[PDB]
Amino acid sequence: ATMKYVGSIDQGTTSTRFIIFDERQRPVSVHQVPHTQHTPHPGWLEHDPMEIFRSACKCMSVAIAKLRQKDASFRKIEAIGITNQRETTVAWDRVTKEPLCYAPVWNDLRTYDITKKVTAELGGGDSMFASKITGLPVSTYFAAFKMRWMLENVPAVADACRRGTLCFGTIDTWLMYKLSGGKAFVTDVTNASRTFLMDLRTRKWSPELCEKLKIPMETLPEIRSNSELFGYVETDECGVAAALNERTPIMGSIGDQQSALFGNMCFEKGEAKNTYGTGCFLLMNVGEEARFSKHGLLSTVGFQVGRDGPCYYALEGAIACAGATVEWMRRNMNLFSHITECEKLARSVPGTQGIVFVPAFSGLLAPYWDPSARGTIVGMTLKTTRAHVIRAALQAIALQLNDVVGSMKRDAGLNLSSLRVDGGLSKNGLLMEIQASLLGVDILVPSMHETTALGAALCAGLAAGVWTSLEEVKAVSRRENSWKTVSPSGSAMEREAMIAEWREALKRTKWAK
Amino acid sequence: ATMKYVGSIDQGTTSTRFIIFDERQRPVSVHQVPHTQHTPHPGWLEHDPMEIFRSACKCMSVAIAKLRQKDASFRKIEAIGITNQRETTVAWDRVTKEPLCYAPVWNDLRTYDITKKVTAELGGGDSMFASKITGLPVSTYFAAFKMRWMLENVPAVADACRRGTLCFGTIDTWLMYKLSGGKAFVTDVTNASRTFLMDLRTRKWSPELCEKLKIPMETLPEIRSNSELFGYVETDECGVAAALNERTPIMGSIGDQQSALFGNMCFEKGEAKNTYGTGCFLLMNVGEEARFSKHGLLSTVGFQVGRDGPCYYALEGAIACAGATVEWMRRNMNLFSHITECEKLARSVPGTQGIVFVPAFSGLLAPYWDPSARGTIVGMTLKTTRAHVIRAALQAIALQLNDVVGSMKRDAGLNLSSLRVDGGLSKNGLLMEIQASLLGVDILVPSMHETTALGAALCAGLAAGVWTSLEEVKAVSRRENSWKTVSPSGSAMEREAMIAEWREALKRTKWAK
């Protein structure tokens, strides 16, 4: 009696959404709203920040109204958590309260030249140079390099630089700013770790690097953890604070790939998960010891729950074309019309019958970092149908995530215990079979699959205390949200003929330049 | 001063047909009769000699019956030429006049063992040991290795040799034997050239080679030209003497591919034909004295008109997967369904935007002789589509020719003046234009696309004086029969780029064993 609810804003790359969870851990209201994907010249990608905040508020109030429709006693939400696309960086004015320009997105490639200035000059040829600090190579992806491009290239931004009006944030910062009404100006540690400006081990700003990299430290917010006060919601954008009825607090903020880690319950070391948006991200919890490169791979914050409380670390690898690849074979190549034709065409053959397909359309980017690798297929005979190609594309995804976990077993010094998985592609029986084989671990597939949203809610649910122990959290997720589970069923030298084929094919992929 | 008709028996691998041509090189009547493809053990292929003979006789009768039924001017046939599938070998008995067994076909692999034994035990391990006499490497194709194999496995054949009675013949010789009711036992120079028992420089049976391979020369027929009197028709095997009415001389005989060359009017040094069927066969006329190859190509007789008459020689290259690759795309891969769409989709993109597709399913048969080559695609992005892949296949078919033509130009010491085409894939104008642009010569396409049977008919009509010379034959064609014409039309820097991409792609094809 007296049912409690926490809210979460999943701000993504192509859309925004808000998801109300109960105390039993169920999404009970949801609403989605897209924003525009602006592409000036090839490789660029911008989002309108106002569009994002407007999206977030419409999600909010429409979701809240729907919960009332099905529970008329719902008076308020205890707290709101955030989670978001990371690296995407916003530029804004402190008293204009508003974007000086569109926000360049994580996978934009406008920063190409600025990356080479830095990796040559500041990095003395070594891209890794800053990596026992940031936990990251130098790339076009991370925040600081966007910040530069914006200080260099934008009339308004360079103008505001000097006048002391220039705030910079990741989307988590920018949401939490306008939501509170200009009141809050903070970031959580996981988001912070993406900026190329944080010290991974102290979880504090790196004044050597801000200075070395020519970004005025006063543009940055105060780092906090993922599970504490951040601001309050005081705005009426799309009737947002009126619909909340009480003043509700913001008590979770967390980067998206780490939000999926937390909400899949990967609290203990050697626990990992794999998300499928377009590509992939694989994240393993490594314990409290910050781990570092041997190959490439990323060192990042997993989650620090609470005021200076226990912090947890992780390694991160990407596959760049995963759900994309299945869609490419359909829309571009006409290999099959309907979605479940793919899964049944793959089953209609015993195996690849010789061939390998390396779905490296836009370079190769898990332990092997060849950006000249292109999409290649080798070993085809006249006895090769689309069924073999579809299966080979599936094998390839798992053969990459194999190489990734191998690298994780090295760098982390641990073994991979569990691997929970989630997305468009985790609803595919045959991949979670193959992958479970080639890696040789159980694989868990959650029936409450909204786990990235769940992550943030939990953070705010802990801070406000709808749950208090991670045992409580984990015990509800056992007594409620069903796992399906998938064992391995493939013999050591089936697996070694498949990797030997794989490593032989990888050699033939180098193409561009 | 009445209308005159030459007929052509065109005896092919899957089928036999008789075309009747008039004095304007118009095919004006045609029947076709298939024959049965017997295959005992995998990779064997074997035809029935008497069944092949009956088709030729039914084709004759029916075409003739249909012709007078619709040409009141048609009185008789002035002569008959024969064109045939080439290396295929028949053993029959002089007394019984009946085959001692079935006929092993050009692409049959039962000569594999013999082919290793002959390369090892007589060419020290060099397969080209006899190439300066025969024009040919040791391979499973050629007639002598089929003749030998029959002595070594078929007891009735060794039997016959002993008793004095045995004949071996290629199909031209066999047809011409039974068409004569056993009176003529002769073979033309072009067919003789594919036995591996003829000396190219003399065009006589090589006593050296017969001795070494241990085929007695009593089992071989008399070598004659392509155009002269071979015999008359004296059988009533499907009322063919009845249908024919008159005495009708057999005055033309020529191997199919050389029939094509001749029927495309390629009478000069540096003229070529490519037949775009399932695979490709290219034959250039190299001139009046042989040229030998250092690229794996075959030297061969092109044609020779008149007993003791000028003999023109040729180089020959093949490629293995042309129309087959189209078929594969369509029916193993579903990149389209209806034939017309292939060229409509290739046409729908400016080029291949970076990709190469080597359709090397059963290896590389052109002048780079890798059988570990397998089908590869390289260079795909998410902007790649079946349109591109398809165009890329056409490009590939075009790049192998270009490379084959190259070899021949080196070995022959001449430029290609002009390329005539035929075969189904000749009705794809996009391939044809990619092909002229690559080669920088116009490409000629005959509207009357019955060139293989026309070759046989010309030889027959020259010897009967229907036509009186090679300037006449070429004039009657130019006047009476239309010719499409396709001129080069692309930058020579796009040309270089494709060849460069082709070359890089080749270097990635290697997969088998």
Ligand SMILES: COc1ccc(N2CCN(Cc3cc(=O)oc4c(O)c(O)ccc34)CC2)cc1
């Ligand atoms: C010039 O040669 C190169 C040197 C370094 C790189 N990298 C830069 C991009 N970075 C991609 C990346 C890998 C990954 O494992 O996770 C990522 C990730 O999680 C992101 O959010 C963004 C980018 C990556 C890999 C190393 C590429 C080419």
Ligand SMILES: COc1ccc(N2CCN(Cc3cc(=O)oc4c(O)c(O)ccc34)CC2)cc1
């Ligand atoms: C690198 O060492 C070699 C590898 C293969 C060969 N071959 C040359 C003969 N070739 C057969 C062949 C080639 C061709 O270009 O056209 C042919 C052809 O037109 C036929 O009718 C039959 C056989 C061939 C297959 C094996 C020779 C040397």
